[PDB]
Structures are given as C-alpha cells and as structure tokens.
Amino acid sequence: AEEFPVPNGFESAYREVDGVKLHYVKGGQGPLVMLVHGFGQTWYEWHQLMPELAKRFTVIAPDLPGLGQSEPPKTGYSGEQVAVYLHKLARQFSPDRPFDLVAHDIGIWNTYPMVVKNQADIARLVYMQAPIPDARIYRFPAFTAQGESLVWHFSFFAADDRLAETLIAGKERFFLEHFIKSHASNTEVFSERLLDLYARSYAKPHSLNASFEYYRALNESVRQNAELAKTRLQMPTMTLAGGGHGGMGTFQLEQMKAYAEDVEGHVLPGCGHWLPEECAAPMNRLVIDFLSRGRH
Amino acid sequence: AEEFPVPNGFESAYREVDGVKLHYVKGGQGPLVMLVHGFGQTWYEWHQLMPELAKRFTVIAPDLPGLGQSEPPKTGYSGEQVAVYLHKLARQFSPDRPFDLVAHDIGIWNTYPMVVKNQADIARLVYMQAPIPDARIYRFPAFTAQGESLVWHFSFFAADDRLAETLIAGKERFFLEHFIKSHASNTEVFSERLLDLYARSYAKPHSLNASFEYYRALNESVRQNAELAKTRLQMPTMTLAGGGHGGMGTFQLEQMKAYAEDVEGHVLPGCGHWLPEECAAPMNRLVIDFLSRGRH
C-alpha cells in the first residue's frame, strides 16, 4: 500500500528507529543524500529530483514522523527530538561516511540539531524555504499591507485546545489547497489530482495531529537552538528561497549567514514556497550542481 | 424573538438607513450616547452599562451591519462605508445636538471615519481595545515566545476562499469560546450560557460571513484612514485598555495621542480584551464619569 507512486528503480521501505517505524523511498548508488520534506507534503515532493540525483548518489527520502507513512515520534516533536530519528536513519545507510542533506520547510527544523551536533557526519547541506527556529521568527508580522503574512499559521497551528485539528477535520482537502496555493507563485502546478494525493495522506487523523504538533513544539525548538547555535556550521551550505508570492526572499540566506561559515544563497524569481514543484528545472539544477561539487 | 434579553426599560427596534434595516436597543432620556460593539458580539455586550448610563442619557446600542439582527450593508464593509450607516442612525435620534460615542474592538474601525468627518456631531468619544486602522497594525507579530499572538486572526479572517467561514461553520460555538477565552484575562465571566447566545448569533450564515468581511476590508480601511487622519480629532476623548492577558495595554492611548489633541487613557490591571464583561464595574464607572463631565 503506497500513498504516492514510487519512481521507476526506487523502493518503498520502512526502518524501525528507536521504536518508531519510519517510511522512506530509496534508490541509486554512491554516497548518500537524504531529502527531508516539509509541512503539507511527504517524501513525494522530491519525486522529480530523486531520479536525477540517483545517477550519482544513493538517495533516501523519508516521511517525517507522524506524516506520510511514518509512525509518530515516541519522544516528542521538537527539533532536537525528531532530528535523532533522522540522523539515525541516515547513519543506518551511511555508517562510515558523511552524507548530504537537503531539507525543505519544517524539514529544516527537524534536521538542524543533528547537523550542528554531528558536523562530521554531514558532507554538504542544502536548506530551502523556512527559518531555522530562533528569535527571528518572532519578528514576522501577523498581517501585511499587500499580499499575505507568511507565518500567521504558526499561531493557528500552535494554538491550544487542538484548535486547528478541530476546525480542519473533515475539511482537509479544502484547507490544503488553500494553504498550498496561498503560499505559491506558480499555482498551476497544483493540479486537483496532485492535491488529492497530498490531502489523502495528511487527512489520516494521526497525521493531521502530527502536522500541528511540530508547530506546538516550535518554541521549544527555538529554546533548544539558542544553545546549539553557539557553534557555527563548518560544511559547505547552500540556501534556496522563492522570490515570488509565498517566498522567503533574502531572509533565507541572511539568517543562514549567522549560522554557517561557508554559505551561498539563491533566490528564484517567480517561485513561491514550493520550489521542487513550482520551479523544478532551476531548483533541481542548483541542487544537483551543488552536491556534485563533492565526490559522487 | 430576540437573540438577547432586553433590559427592563429598554426597547428593541429597527430603522432603515440608506436601504439597510438596522437593529438597535434604546432607552433612557437626555443627550444621546451610541455604544458600538465589536467582533464576536452584538449590542448585548453593553447590557450591563446600559441601565446605569440610561439614568443620565438616551442610550442606543446598534448591531453592526450583518451582525446580530442587522441587515448586511449594501455598500461595503470598509470603515468609511459602515460609518455612514452608524452616523445616519445616530442623527435620526440626535438631529439637533452632538452625541457621545463609545466603541469597542472593530466598533472603532466602523466609527472613526464618521467621527473625523463630522466632528461637530460628536460631543465626547470613548474608544477601547482595538487599533484605529493604520500602519501600526502591520507591526504586530505573527507568533510569540509564549504561543499564539494577539492579532494572527486578522490574516485568518482576511484570507480568501472563504477560509474562515468554511473551517468555522459547524464549529461556531467551539471557535468563539476559544477566541474569546484566548483574548481574555478573566475567562470566568463568560458562562457557557453567554457563549451559547453569542455563538448562535454569529453562526447565522450571513453574520458569520459579515464578521470576516470587516477584516477583508481592513487594508482598505487603513488606506482610507491614511487620508482622513490629516485632520486631528478635537473632541474630548478617553481610551480604555486591558492590562492583563489579551489586553493592548499602553498601545491604545499611545496611538490615540497621534490622533487626538484632548485625550486621557486608562489601563485596567487584571482585564483582557473584553472590558465590558471582564471588568464591568470599573469600566462602567470610567465611562459614566467621563461622559458625565458633559451635560446630561
């Protein structure tokens, strides 16, 4: 049973990690690259990039705990807790060599602590379209004069009394289409068919709840990162962001400069939050070229 | 039938204003005071102040267009459009003398333009618990280190695709309780019965939509006010705000200093957003005394 179609030559499998069964899709040969998705999506957001990378790398794309076909975390949903699961999964497949990491949106929240605590395990790093949890997130506006506030949903999703789950239950397909398109520049790529696939996955009751638990743990993640950030990242790093509606623009690189010694950034014009789908050609090229600077 | 119990000595009635049938509750004798409610509520939020005020004044408390038992506006929901209805309603009852105005929450948005454009018609002004729409609103944060922020709902309510109506329909009582209590210090003043009454009113499909249309017009109101605010307010003005959880604290008076030449303010410790209910006795006292400095 698969929620999304596996690309030719890839396998859908599971690995138990600290008592949590994680789902992932894997293919290719060579040094390992792990691709970590974000909110509203699953491993599938990577399905176009995966075959291209698999010509040079072993590629693994997991579902975040609780999302897609992965069981919820047994510890918690803060960045440091979730990162343990992802670090251990990657190291099962690359126990004696560093691996590459690509993360989108909350995939960043869930990987940053394991990158900073295990720097020698991370060869190259690509982060796109979300702030690393820190005090900067408290400076984003609730309401804007033009366009729409990028992160008002942080408060919605974090609210007590299971506000978001209670409102969104039974309306997952409607909500996800609005959420995705409102954060996009190239909305046309989100066909009803694709939206149906994503909606069916996050509408699983435990997945809808897990989605919001990441946001309920966000302040804890900020507190965790205040300590961890005392050590800068030393590996080559690339940031990507959309310059269109829904994009983070210059924020992504500007924040990362406070975290990394070796960083280059790109802002992709006419692209919003959903880079792998809205702007597949230029995004895939940037990622493939950047990772191919290392051995492959 | 009435959505809310009318106080003894008061009358529930209707007037046509520019083709729109407005509901109001009226009582007392002497100069006119109009009391204007805000989001999530109706004329009834004034029901404790009304009897006391009616000892010295003629008191009218209308339902905002589309809310309570008032017809939706036929022009629009921007501050300038709505203010026309309320100004003309007041003038039906006070054609020969200026009247006093007390407004709470979005009642401010819906009255400011008629106050600044008809200053000779306004004897004294009391504003509580919401910014006059201006560039200040764009500085409020989307998220806080303690959880959900004060005005993330501006974005939720302003969102297109009828986001708020779609998610809240069927869950109106649930949502309103969370909303009210999340903006309150004294949650206990909101009995289950009171929440039932307010929830049944705004759950009317046209009222649920009307509620959010005020926010969908907020940026337009900000732009309208940018021109209007070139003329300062000259009448005696008082601001009130809550000093506790949910309250705006010093913001209310500090903003009003930029609009009004003659202003005094108070911050009420231990009170949140809903002054008339959370802190009825002290709020009532401050209003009655301020308005009684004039002729009654």
Is residue A62 exposed (0-12), middle (13-18) or buried (19+ Cβ within 10 Å)? buried
Identity of the residue numbered B207:
S
Please name the helix (run of DSSP H) or strand (run of DSSP E) that holds residue A62, with its range, or none.
Answer: strand A58-62
- What the block records as the tokens of B161 is 């695709």
At A151, list the tokens: 């992160």
B149: contact with A, CB 8 A cutoff: yes
> What angle, rounded to 10 degrees, do the helices at B218-228 and B205-216 form?
50
Cβ–Cβ contact A147 with B under 8 A: no
Per this entry, what is the length of chain A? 296
Q: Could A149 and B166 be called an inter-chain contact, meaning their C-beta atoms sit closer than 8 Å?
A: no
Integer Cα distance of B81 and B92 in angstroms:
18
Q: Which residue of B has its CA nearest to A216?
A: B147
Query: Are A175 and B167 an interchain contact pair (Cβ–Cβ within 8 Å)?
Result: yes
Alpha-carbon gap: B239 to the closest alpha carbon of chain A (Å)? 24
List residues bridging with A292 in a β-sheet: none
Chain-centroid distance of CA A70 in Å reads 15
Chain A residues touching residue B174 (CB < 8 angstroms): 166
B chain contacts of residue A150, beta-carbon cutoff 8 Å: 142
| CA separation, residue B172 to residues A22, A211, B106, B178, B249 (Å) | 37, 23, 19, 10, 29
Question: Cα(A23)–Cα(A11) distance, rounded to whole angstroms?
Answer: 11
Cite the DSSP H helix spans in chain B.
49-53, 79-93, 106-109, 112-117, 152-158, 163-168, 172-182, 192-202, 205-216, 218-228, 251-259, 275-278, 280-292
Chain B residue numbers touching A138 (CB-CB < 8 A): 141, 143-145
Q: Do B178 and A156 touch (CB under 8 A)?
A: no
Interface contact B143-A163, CB threshold 8 A: no
Nearest to B236 by CA among B79, B127, B109, B96: B127
CA–CA separation, A141 and A150 (whole Å): 8
Residues 6+ apart with CB under 8 A from B59: B26, B27, B28, B32, B33, B35, B50, B53
- What does this entry list as its resolution, in Å? 1.7
- With beta carbons under 8 A apart, name residues in chain B contacting A154: 142-143, 152
B266 in Cβ contact with B286 (< 8 Å): yes
Interface test with A, best of B137, B143, B181 (most A CBs within 10 A): B143
Nearest CA in chain A to B137: A143
State whether residue A142 sits within 8 Å of chain B by CB. yes
DSSP A260: B
- B241 Cβ contact list (under 8 Å, min separation 6): B128, B129, B247, B248, B249, B250, B251, B252, B253, B265, B266, B267, B268, B275
Q: Which residues pair with B293 in a beta bridge?
A: none
Determine the residue type at B66: G
* Helix B192-202, helix B172-182: angle, nearest 10: 120
Chain B residue numbers with beta carbons less than 8 Å from the beta carbon of A225 are none
Decide: helix, strand or coil at residue B154.
helix
Interface contact A148, partner B, CB < 8 A: yes
CA distance A172 to chain B (A): 10
CA atoms of A188 and A174, how far apart (whole Å): 16
Report d(CA B36, CA B41) in Å as an integer.
Answer: 10
Pairing of strands A11-17, A20-28: antiparallel
The three state secondary structure string of B189-229 is HCCHHHHHHHHHHHCCHHHHHHHHHHHHCHHHHHHHHHHHC
Residues of A in contact with B175 (CB under 8 A): 163, 167
The answer to whether A42 and A50 are in contact (CB under 8 A) is no
Q: Which amino acid is at A40?
A: G
Nearest Cα of chain A lies from the Cα of B131 at a distance, in angstroms, of: 13
Q: Domains of chain B: which residue ranges?
A: 9-292
Q: Give A169's strand partners.
A: none
B143, B178, B182: residue with CB nearest A154 = B143
The backbone torsions φ and ψ at residue A250, rounded to the nearest 5 degrees and listed phi first, read -75, -10
Strands A32-36 and A58-62: parallel
Instruction: Give ∠ CA B178-B181-B182 in degrees, rounded to 5.
Output: 75
- Asked whether B66 and B202 are in contact (CB, 8 A), the reply is no
CB B182 within 8 A of CB B148: yes
Closest by CA position to A179, among listed A148, A221, A146, A216 = A148
Three-class secondary structure of residue A163 per DSSP:
helix
Here the tokens at position A84 are 């343990």
Question: Do A222 and A215 meet the contact criterion of CB atoms below 8 Å apart?
Answer: no
**CB contact at 8 A, A49 and A287:** yes
Structure tokens at A264: 């280059």
- From CA A248, how far away is CA A19, in angstroms rounded? 36
Return the CATH number of the domain spanning residue range B9-292.
3.40.50.1820
Return the residue in B136, B146, B152, B225 with the most chain A beta carbons within 10 A, the one to mutate for interface testing: B152
Residues in chain B: 296
Residue numbers after which chain B is interrupted (C to N above 2.5 A) read none
Q: How far apart are CA A115 and CA A103, in angstroms?
A: 11
Other Cβ atoms closer than 10 A to A12: 16
Pick among A148, A152, A214 to test the B interface (most B CBs inside 10 A): A152
Distance CA A290, CA A296 (A): 11
What distance lies between CA A142 and its chain's CA centroid?
Answer: 23
* Spatial CA neighbour of A249 closest among A227, A225, A265: A265
The answer to whether the CB of B247 falls within 8 A of the CB of B272 is yes
Residue B33 backbone phi and psi in degrees, to 5: -125, 125
Name the DSSP class of B141. Answer: B
Residue pointed to by tokens 């789950």:
A165
Tell me the C-alpha distance between B63 and B47, whole Å. Answer: 13
A175 part of contact set with chain B, CB < 8 Å: yes
The region, left, alpha or beta by phi > 0 then psi within -120 to 50, assigned to residue A110 is alpha
Mutation test of the interface with chain A: which of B144, B155, B156, choosing the one with the most A Cβ atoms within 10 A?
B155
Cβ atoms B286, B54 nearer than 8 A: no
Chain centroid to CA B175: 20
Q: Under a CB-based contact definition with an 8 Å cutoff, are residues A35 and A49 in contact? A: yes
Cβ atoms of residues A170 and A147 within 8 Å: no
* Token pair of B72 as six digits: 């939706």
Deposited experimental method: X-ray
A88: amino acid identity, one letter: K
Chain B residue with CA closest to A133: the answer is: B145
Q: Looking at beta carbons, which pairs linking B284-288 to residues 24 or more positions away fall under 8 Å?
A: B284/B48, B284/B49, B284/B52, B284/B53, B286/B238, B286/B240, B287/B49, B287/B53, B287/B102, B287/B126, B287/B238, B287/B240, B288/B49, B288/B52, B288/B53, B288/B56
Question: Tokens 């009828």 appear where?
Answer: B162
- Cβ contact (<8 Å) for A142 and B158? no
